[PDB]
Motif scaffolding. Structure first.
Motif, short mmCIF file in Angstrom:
data_model
loop_
_atom_site.label_atom_id
_atom_site.label_comp_id
_atom_site.label_asym_id
_atom_site.label_seq_id
_atom_site.Cartn_x
_atom_site.Cartn_y
_atom_site.Cartn_z
N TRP A 240 0.80 -1.22 0.00
CA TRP A 240 0.00 0.00 0.00
C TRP A 240 0.84 1.27 0.00
CZ3 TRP A 240 -0.24 3.74 3.94
CH2 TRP A 240 0.51 3.43 5.08
N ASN A 241 2.13 1.19 0.28
CA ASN A 241 3.00 2.36 0.35
C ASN A 241 4.13 2.29 -0.67
OD1 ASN A 241 4.36 0.29 1.60
ND2 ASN A 241 4.40 1.26 3.63
N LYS A 242 3.87 1.69 -1.83
CA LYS A 242 4.84 1.58 -2.90
C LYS A 242 4.20 2.05 -4.20
CE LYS A 242 7.54 -2.17 -0.84
NZ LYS A 242 6.78 -2.13 0.44
#
Length: 49
Positions: free
Chosen positions: A10-12
DNA sequence: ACTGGAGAAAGAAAGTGAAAGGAAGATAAAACGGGATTCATACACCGTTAAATACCGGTTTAAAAATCCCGTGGCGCGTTTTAAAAAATCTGTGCGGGTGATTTTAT
């Protein structure tokens, strides 16, 4: 499970949908691809879930 | 000469692309009818008075009301039709995973 295995967290950065559909069809789901893409689309609409 | 297969001619029946036209639709221009302003002008309300009308007493009389006999057509009954409204039964359709297929452009 395929998205988790690909490491699409979710954070890439984002990934192309065709790559995910190809992985799912070639490794786990022995069916068509248009239905898989339509299923993926519905899980992202704010007015559906 | 004769036989039977095969190819070519000829003829008749069916499918075809094109056909006025007309009722059946469709789309614009026009005539209409219903609100917001703007006052001048005619209409509503208030004192005064001559005159026109309502009212009472007693006749009357001609007209309308009351009464009797009768002979009919206009309502009433029973039984059918016939539209009209209501209840019952079919027909589509979209939601989400699945199966399989189509088309047009540039160089």
């Amino acid at each position: 499970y395929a998205m988790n295995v690909l490491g699409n967290d979710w954070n890439k950065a984002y990934k192309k949908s065709a790559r995910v559909v190809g992985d799912v069809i070639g490794k786990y789901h022995p069916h068509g691809d248009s239905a898989v893409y339509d299923t993926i689309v519905r899980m992202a609409q704010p007015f559906s879930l």
